[PDB]
């Protein structure tokens, strides 16, 4: 089966063995069939954990590298370690991105799916951007932007303002603006617009209601943080 591979994925997950988890979901996806919701959520959880360890490590090693502007033999080591880490992080981003292009985005048969995967493309190009160089960065940044912007176009047309997926896109695209493009006014109004539109369209099913409000809280937390 491949139902088997999904069951293995869930095991891995319960064992907090995210590399295993990611390897299962990679092969499920590569079986070529559109993923169920559950599967989509397993794939994404898997790769978030795999990539988040490298991001988190990268920030530690970068901080150290720069806080030792005086030592040298150390700066040489930290730097080389940062870049070993960056290599892992890139290969990961590349596998996810390749998976999105080859399988997930083309077969996405619902708008809810398409948006989900497009946002995901934006996120992964975003992590590629955070660790970009001085001769690749604008290329990667525009890729991130374009994925978010198409996802954003579709969700605005196809989905309700309280849609947790539509809301989550707005949270991540606004973060893209603040951190990647250094456009805080832009990040702010993207987040504010998405919060207010959800406030207006309050009349939101019972299931989603619970993730919606939360994300709205996160939107407002970023707004207030970014003020002053």
């Amino acid at each position: 089966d491949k139902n088997e591979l999904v069951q293995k994925a869930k095991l891995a997950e319960q064992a907090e063995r995210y590399d295993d988890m990611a390897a299962c979901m990679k092969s499920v996806t590569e079986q070529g069939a559109e993923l169920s919701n559950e599967e989509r959520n397993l794939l994404s959880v898997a790769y978030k954990n795999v990539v988040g360890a490298r991001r988190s490590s990268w920030r530690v090693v970068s901080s150290i590298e720069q806080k030792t502007e005086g030592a040298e033999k150390k700066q040489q080591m930290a730097r080389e370690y940062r870049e070993k880490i960056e290599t892992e992080l890139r290969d990961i981003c590349n596998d996810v991105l390749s998976l999105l292009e080859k399988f997930l985005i083309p077969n996405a048969s619902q708008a809810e799916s398409k948006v989900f995967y497009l946002k995901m493309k934006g996120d992964y190009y975003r992590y590629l951007a955070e660790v970009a160089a001085g001769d690749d960065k604008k290329g990667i940044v525009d890729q991130s932007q374009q994925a978010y912007q198409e996802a954003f176009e579709i969700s605005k047309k196809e989905m309700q303002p309280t849609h947790p997926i539509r809301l989550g896109l707005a949270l991540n695209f606004s973060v893209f603006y603040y951190e990647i493009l250094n456009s805080p006014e832009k990040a702010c109004s993207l987040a504010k617009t998405a919060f207010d539109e959800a406030i207006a369209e309050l009349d939101l099913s019972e299931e989603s209601y619970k993730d919606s409000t939360l994300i709205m809280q996160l939107l407002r937390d970023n707004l207030t943080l970014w003020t002053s």
């Binding site: 994404s44 978030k48 920030r59 955070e130 973060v175 994300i215 970023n222 943080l225």
Partner: peptide, 10 residues
Amino acid sequence: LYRSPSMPEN
């Protein structure tokens, strides 16, 4: 250290 305040898996 710094956490980009994007979407969590809850």
